Amino acid sequence: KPRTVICVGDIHGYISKLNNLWLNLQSAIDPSDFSSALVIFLGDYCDRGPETRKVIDFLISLPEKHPDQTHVFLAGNHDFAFSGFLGLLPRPSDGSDLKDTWKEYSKSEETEGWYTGEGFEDMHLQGRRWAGKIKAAYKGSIYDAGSTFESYGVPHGSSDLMKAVPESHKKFLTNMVWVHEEDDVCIETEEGLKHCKLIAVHAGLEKGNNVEEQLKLLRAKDTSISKIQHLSGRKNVWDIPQELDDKHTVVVSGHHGKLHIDGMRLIIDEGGGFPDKPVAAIVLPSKKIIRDTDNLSS
């Protein structure tokens, strides 16, 4: 029997949506298949929603709760930005300073009110944007990070967040990956069951540039990049790029604020960080969509 693969869209601090989805998934999938499933969280665990802390608590608990599952946690643009503010990103491997990332977006500083509190000098651009105060509705910053601060019991933009975030959560953020690759997953098509490669990346992959070169920087976590298009892009990462456009690779992403299935391109982000929208997961091989808003039993 083919292994069950669950790909979970953006959570954005909605603990109730995360819990209800997890509970629904256990009625849609039989106990044996669920217990040994590959579970790929597609990123964006923080911001917008009110309970980031509880979300990360939940995700940390999963290895203990389900020892035979494989758990993959993609870094979203939001979580990369979160990790940046906490100073958890490794120094750029090219020897540059994290402050060098600011220059490209320097004209955005005034409107975005970038963090100028303690430790801003050694901070990645996205960390400074994340903890900024946007001139006005946004929750504190352009990243809607206000609710993340509050979920850990501190005001928005506070340097004290660094002390409030538990060590296990910092370890969780350090353990996130920018890409996940699988050699062999099953997926239903109109013609029948297929075996495919899988690439999981929060937003997607770029056109033009060699795919392996892209995957290389993603595997290595290059912090010299001001804005990581693979985590933050929109139209530029929507499509499967030329090199992978041959029906042998599933490319799964969250990020886009839409649930969109087009052949081998899976975009799983029905929630979009909105409080009134469902969080959806896709279950492979069947491609069935399970939501927090479901009321399932077996």
Ligand SMILES: [Zn+2]
């Ligand atoms: Zn998102």
Ligand SMILES: [Zn+2]
């Ligand atoms: Zn995103």
